[PDB]
Amino acid sequence: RRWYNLATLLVVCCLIYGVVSLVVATIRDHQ
Amino acid sequence: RRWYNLATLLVVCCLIYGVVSLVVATIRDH
Amino acid sequence: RRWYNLATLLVVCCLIYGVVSLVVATIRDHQD
Amino acid sequence: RRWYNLATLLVVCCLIYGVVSLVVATIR
Amino acid sequence: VKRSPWQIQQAVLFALFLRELKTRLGGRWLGVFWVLLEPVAHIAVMTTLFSLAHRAAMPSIEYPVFLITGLIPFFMFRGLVTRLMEAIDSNRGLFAYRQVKPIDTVIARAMLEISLQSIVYLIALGTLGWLGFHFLPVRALELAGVSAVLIMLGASLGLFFAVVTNEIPQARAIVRISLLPLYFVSGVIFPVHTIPPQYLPLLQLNPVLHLIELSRASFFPQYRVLQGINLAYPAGFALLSLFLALMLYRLRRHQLAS
Amino acid sequence: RSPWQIQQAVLFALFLRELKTRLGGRWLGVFWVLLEPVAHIAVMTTLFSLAHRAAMPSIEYPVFLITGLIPFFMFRGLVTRLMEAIDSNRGLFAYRQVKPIDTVIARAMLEISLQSIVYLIALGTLGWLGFHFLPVRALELAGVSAVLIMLGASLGLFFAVVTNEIPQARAIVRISLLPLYFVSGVIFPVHTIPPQYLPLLQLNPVLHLIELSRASFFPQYRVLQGINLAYPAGFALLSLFLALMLYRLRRHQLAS
Amino acid sequence: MIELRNLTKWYPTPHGRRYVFRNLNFRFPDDVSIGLIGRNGAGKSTLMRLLGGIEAPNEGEVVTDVSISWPVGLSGGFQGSLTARENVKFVCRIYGTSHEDMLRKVRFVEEFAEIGEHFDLPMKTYSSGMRSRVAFGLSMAFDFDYYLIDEAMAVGDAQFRAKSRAVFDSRVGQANMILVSHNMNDIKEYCDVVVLVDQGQATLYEDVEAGIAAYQGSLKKAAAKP
Amino acid sequence: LTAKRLQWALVYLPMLVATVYFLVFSADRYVSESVITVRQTSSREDTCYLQTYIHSMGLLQKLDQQLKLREHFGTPLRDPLFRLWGGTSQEWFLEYYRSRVEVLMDDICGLLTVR
Ligand SMILES: CCCCCCCCCCCC(=O)O[C@@H](COC(=O)CCCCCCCCCC)COP(=O)(O)OC[C@H](O)CO[C@@]1(C(=O)O)C[C@H](O)[C@@H](O)[C@H]([C@@H](O)CO)O1
């Protein structure tokens, strides 16, 4: 399922980007 | 049953009056 | 069911418009 | 499974390090 | 610069997220231990209580993944209720800088809980894959949609309770006490198929049961759902609750400042 | 003035204050404490009446529910109300005749008097409805009730002393008072649970106390194995000893 | 420029609505020092905090093109579980300043406060002098067109008041003050024109002496009621 | 982002689209329900067999050979959503048929209702 896998991939890659942006922001502020 | 449905209509009318008054108060404060 | 679908859609977009308008007013509340 | 065993050992060893380091820092 | 309201909203959300993470995870990050310890304890207790019963109930699905898929979303929902509801008194003294409206506290707590439970969920699926269980959903974006519906329902309920119980700091304990049977009834520990049918329609009044079943169905391959379970009922519950919460917040916006 | 007389004086005054604040300004709490067993009974009968009739055909469901519920209500009130007594009178510890244990005893006596009134009223309306409402062996019922009261008060004092700090833990115990309802034989007779789950349920002393109170209440009621009174008696004695020890040691830091 | 249009402020009470402000329309003079003084409890503090934006007006609005500080000595403004450093970091992150500039601000406020060991300690254990000190140092950190003082000068010991006055006169010339004080010498020393807020209305006086004389006259009128 | 734009782009436009679809573009669909049971002549397994076989593929091959389902379902050109587009794949045809024929089971009686 090409387009379906692309859509779920977009969703996951975004979620992890948001989470890792938050964690890199707080680890930048902490140190 | 004449008297039975009147109570249900009273309850639903009171509920609709309450919710419509609350949203009217919302749109008046806006 | 044409009329039932139309009424359901009217309720849904009315609620959606109200929610997004409240959100817009909430963000617009900040006036620095 | 050599690589699997090495990976799960690494994970547990790091966890153990994390918990002992956290308690030995918070005792201070 | 003029600094348009979206910019100051980002700034206060970012700063408040730092402030709230500094205390939610606890000083020296001692809370993350309990954060990943709680699902492990739940899994252990439920599996050594009901492993054979669940195996006899439905043999197609092994118990730990069926436990995780209904446990972690409920943990996120419970966090998004209880943590969110007490967002007013914890920052009551902070309401003196003109860019510190209480909706920022609500949003900051919601995003912190969302992120924490997202990392916990990813770690849980990683471990389940590492132990040889089934750990990839077959319909991922449908699962994401049901998860989003559950998240927004929980956030709406948390905002509604935080708005309502402001003058009354109590009834929060009663909220948690009522949240416990919601854990015990939404089918997060045992499959709901074995429930006798005469109790079935009343249990369908709980939208969390619908959301849990829909999230489980899109995860496993060939997982049946009961009649009367749909997405429209929890979606309408969530939308109406969000509208009511936002309207109640708009009414008493000035009263949440002391 | 003897210490005993000033102790009666301070307990009387603290009982007056705590009875004033326990109920509402116009006595709204009495309605709630009268209605809560009624709502519990309504839900429980309407959910398990036929099942309990099938359980044993010798004991009516409402009397079984009352006899297993009112002692549990008293125990839960004693556990959950005794531990807020420290924080309710932080500023009151400045008159040199007021000690925290006086607040503890005042709250406990009120919890006991209110639940005893509720028990008498419930037995009265149960007899008024044509049910069975006379205990066959009332002295053993009084003994088991006294053991349950002492265990509950001891646990309440222990939690009041330990959790003087970290008030979040206070909240926690109220959560753990919810599953204790669903296990200690209050709702359904314990003869129907599968037997291999039995001993894991037998470390709960409230289950033993509820079973013995029901056995002394009804005529020809069957108890299982290992439902001795010695285990709850020892649990209550040990809990009271530890609670009094911890109150004595951690006495001076309960100041204003 | 400061302009006030149709201000209405009250709070619900069991004995009715205790109205404080009702349709206030007035323009403030620019580049001059304002001594805001009125009857105690008649609306001085609520006027200060609506000028500070803490409570937006229910009706009407204020219009300005300059920066007005929050009330100094805002001990309850900072959150308890955070340290003084963490509260400062939060405050500069609120205003969205750069990383190195905000580092300069936290170094400046820790140099002013001189608390030292307790500077990395949560502020529920702080004494009133320390929180007042960090509040003063933090308020003096930001460059602002106008500053709001709720009689926070006379409090504290002599040495803290001395460096507070020193940094204050360092801030005069580039910035202007609004004084809310019960010590008349402060208004005759640091104010140019005087407003008087009585019974829900504000009257301007270009003369400070005329303003304080009208203040004593209003006090005598209040004391003259039988 | 005024209120007029929000009302036009969230309320009036979707209701207008739905109105001009459901009134002048939609195609009527008649349902014909029936209630059946299979019994031994002098039974849950046989009704599972029937429930699976109704949504099967060989039944579709037989029915498409018999009653010309494909060219019937392509007749309404006004409605573009519920019509069967010509030249579509076999799997799409199977899913379309499974959507059109609805089978419900009464487990208390083991009765198959087919609409
Ligand atoms: C699994 C068993 C049955 C199912 C229950 C499912 C629980 C319902 C869902 C949660 C409902 C809810 O509201 O949450 C509850 C969690 O349920 C419990 O109590 C477990 C009860 C254990 C006793 C049972 C004995 C039975 C008796 C037989 C004789 C309070 O925990 P919480 O996570 O909300 O507290 C977080 C607070 O914000 C802050 O508290 C801290 C913190 O972080 O500073 C501090 C401290 O460590 C502790 O209070 C806390 C934590 O670490 C310690 O478990 O965290």
Author numbering:
A (entry chain F): 340 to 370
B (entry chain H): 340 to 369
C (entry chain G): 340 to 371
D (entry chain E): 340 to 367
E (entry chain C): 12 to 269
F (entry chain D): 14 to 269
G (entry chain A): 1 to 226
H (entry chain G): 9 to 50, 72 to 144
Published text:
The transporter partners with the periplasmic and inner-membrane-anchored KpsE subunit, a class-3 polysaccharide co-polymerase (PCP), as well as with KpsD, which is assumed to form an outer-membrane pore. Cryo-electron microscopy analyses of the KpsMT–KpsE complex in six different states reveal a KpsE-encaged ABC transporter, rigid-body conformational rearrangements of KpsMT during ATP hydrolysis and recognition of a glycolipid inside a membrane-exposed electropositive canyon.
To determine how KpsMT recognizes the glycolipid, the purified KpsMT–KpsE complex was preincubated with the isolated glycolipid before cryo grid preparation. Cryo-EM analyses of this sample provided additional cryo-EM maps similar in overall architecture to the Apo 1 state, but with poorly defined KpsT subunits. However, in contrast to all other structures, we identified two states of a lipid molecule bound inside the canyon (referred to as state-1 and state-2). Therefore, we modelled the putative ligand as a phosphatidylglycerol-linked Kdo monosaccharide, with the caveat that the Kdo conformation and its interactions are not precisely resolved. In state-1, with the putative Kdo sugar closer to the cytosolic water–lipid interface, the sugar moiety is sandwiched between TM1 and TM5 of opposing KpsM protomers. The following phosphate group is near Arg94 of TM2. One lipid acyl chain snakes through the hydrophobic segment of the canyon, where it is surrounded by Phe85 and Phe86 of TM2, as well as by Leu191, Tyr194 and Phe195 of TM5 of the same protomer. The second acyl chain points away from the KpsM subunits and does not mediate extensive protein interactions.
